[PDB]
Write a protein that binds this ligand. Sequence first.
Ligand SMILES: Nc1nc2c(ncn2[C@@H]2O[C@H](COP(=O)(O)OP(=O)(O)O[C@H]3O[C@H](CO)[C@@H](O)[C@H](O)[C@@H]3O)[C@@H](O)[C@H]2O)c(=O)[nH]1
Ligand SMILES: Nc1nc2c(ncn2[C@@H]2O[C@H](COP(=O)(O)OP(=O)(O)O[C@H]3O[C@H](CO)[C@@H](O)[C@H](O)[C@@H]3O)[C@@H](O)[C@H]2O)c(=O)[nH]1
Lengths: 392, 392
Amino acid sequence: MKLIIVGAHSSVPSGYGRVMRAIVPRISKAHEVIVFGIHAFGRSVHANIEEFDAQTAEHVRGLNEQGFYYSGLSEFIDVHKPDIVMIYNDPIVIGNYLLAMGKCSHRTKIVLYVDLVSKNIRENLWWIFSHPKVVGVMAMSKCWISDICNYGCKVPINIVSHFVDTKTIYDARKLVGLSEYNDDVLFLNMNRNTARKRLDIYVLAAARFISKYPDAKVRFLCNSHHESKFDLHSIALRELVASGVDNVFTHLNKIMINRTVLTDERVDMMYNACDVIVNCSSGEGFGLCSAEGAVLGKPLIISAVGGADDYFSGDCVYKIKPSAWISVDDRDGIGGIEGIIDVDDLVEAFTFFKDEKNRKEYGKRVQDFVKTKPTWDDISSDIIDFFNSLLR
Amino acid sequence: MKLIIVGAHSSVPSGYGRVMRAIVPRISKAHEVIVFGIHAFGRSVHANIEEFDAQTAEHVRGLNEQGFYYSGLSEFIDVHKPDIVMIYNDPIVIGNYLLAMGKCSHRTKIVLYVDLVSKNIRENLWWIFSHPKVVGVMAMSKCWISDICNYGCKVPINIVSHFVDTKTIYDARKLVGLSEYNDDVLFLNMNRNTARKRLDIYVLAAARFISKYPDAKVRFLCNSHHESKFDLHSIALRELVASGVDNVFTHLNKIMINRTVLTDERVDMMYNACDVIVNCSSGEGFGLCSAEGAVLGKPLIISAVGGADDYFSGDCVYKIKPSAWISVDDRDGIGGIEGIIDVDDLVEAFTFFKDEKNRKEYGKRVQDFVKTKPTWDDISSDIIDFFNSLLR
Ligand SMILES: Nc1nc2c(ncn2[C@@H]2O[C@H](COP(=O)(O)OP(=O)(O)O[C@H]3O[C@H](CO)[C@@H](O)[C@H](O)[C@@H]3O)[C@@H](O)[C@H]2O)c(=O)[nH]1
Ligand SMILES: Nc1nc2c(ncn2[C@@H]2O[C@H](COP(=O)(O)OP(=O)(O)O[C@H]3O[C@H](CO)[C@@H](O)[C@H](O)[C@@H]3O)[C@@H](O)[C@H]2O)c(=O)[nH]1
């Protein structure tokens, strides 16, 4: 069959671009595939398969539609006359795409691959799952099935998770310039400083732990870009002052904040250099910044939310259940509800993993578990198996 | 003594407006008090005490200092030459007035009436507690004393709480327009639809309670302005669909939003009308609203936060403890951390008070307990004692 995939361009170094570099060349040997690549930063990584540069074509026609190029998708499908059109992004973006090709010449058969991260997304977006043209839906996890079914979806739903592979680098500690901290156990959170990822709880818990164990050789690593909503050292300073502990400043310095944007391998070096990988976010479609440490044999503390909860655990990970629920509607146009973990639960989780006997045991568990997990070849073969069932 | 209070003008229908209307006339008989009244809505409510209309004077000088009239305070103090100056606001506003009188000619003693609302307010505001002109600090509740100390306060700290004066009104639900709901038990949340107040939780717990008991004669009431940030019916609607319960739109109608602003009479009428008073906010300095329903012998469900926790005995009231803690830095320039109750805990509370024998019992309990509290005259006298102590 002739397939059209509407998603991130192969040049994009994002979460979406990561999977598009992997999934497309694997379906190329199964079906004739042509791509509608968006937000293109440079040239096409693939040498053979046809890919449309939607950002440059938008620049040529004289538009600034953020790089998505909705207005030209109508003309694009009419020429390429596909058997199946796949859409891969968050609720909002699909909503604009289906609105754009409402007057599209070819009678195609639409498949959705939604980026869902929170339950109870806004009502003005559920119409995409009931769309009389969408014949198939792809979810990132088992947890989203019930939701997608609640949003009024009468068509077959297929689970399409992700696989990940980080470079295993020996002597990583020294190479990222952490040589001075050889004695300390290092906790890592690679998540970006946004509300969803709740680094305020991370940094909050770090301060509680440090205050009750002021002499533990430990460091807490995290990232943050210029003047984002949470000032992480400021949050930690205030909780250390409230705790009554002496040497607030030296204790505060135990939280190490990276501000520069790293290369793909500095990220890999960072993963190898550390001892515990942490994610305490309120919403997860999948949670790449955790699975990436599981292959290296690092023990894991995760919030039991969304995709992370389904993907993990034969009791191989430290899972913290959300203690409360709030509305996320003020965050963005997607909205919904998310689960917040208790900070003190994160403190319990930390003291658990300052014991090296524990890090060794669970780090061995996660690696042996993620061994069984489906690779990109297993996943992409499941993608086409779902496509064949919708034609005959 | 000559005393100047920088605070809300008589006409202001806010939290600060209410306590200013009560405190000023009572200090007037002991001392000469003149008011730098800010944010005026019109005529001064007091016939004889001197109240300065700071907002209109601001307009006369063609300034827009949001009715605070920072530019005017310095000159106002130099003229009146008061013995003491009381600044009654939050830390940012106090900060700004302190800089305003930075180049003041009159040597004067400053007393701060701080409205705190969360632990861990930003450190760049802490300076106001150890400002050299600051001679004393007044706080609203016992819980805030240890925070102000942690912030580095070396001056006397006094507790100045609040009293509540709501009239008892006969035939109340007929008068507010709720005569169609005689059999229904009415839960009342009088709080403003802001983030702090967590009406997203209230509404969400209402939805979960309704889906649990579809035929329970119950109504939930709350408030919201033109275009706030939580669309309450939206949150409610989405949760009902999730539970799978039928007759969604009728069940949704049980949650009643009041968009219309209310006069002092109608607020009092609402309290009289309803069967259970609810406050599920993540931050309270003292926590008016709930205390307003307690003098009428109405049962209260409250979040055990800030001043609400100090003020009510756990035996006379249904207290819910926070389950999770989050940063608030994104909300305001003040910031801090606040505690959030579990939505399922609020459900337990709602089902506890659907039985009338519990409402009768806990109603009698609060009325008897709040009876033993200090009145406004007890509070005003304590205020004037504190000032005398600081003078000689
Ligand atoms: N090169 C580089 N990469 C970085 C850097 N910082 C983070 N990354 C990488 O950025 C990727 C982003 O992963 P997520 O954090 O899990 O994705 P997201 O922003 O939460 O958004 C969605 O993406 C995934 C689905 O494609 C989901 O895992 C996730 O739940 C969510 O739906 C991770 O692989 C992380 O290693 C950096 O400084 N440099
Ligand atoms: N006139 C009028 N008053 C209203 C209305 N709605 C609410 N109010 C009044 O608003 C008053 C104050 O509300 P609070 O519960 O105290 O919250 P807050 O003022 O917004 O927040 C902070 O300020 C207070 C300081 O005195 C603290 O009591 C409170 O805990 C918190 O720190 C209550 O007495 C209530 O009667 C209305 O529609 N009209």
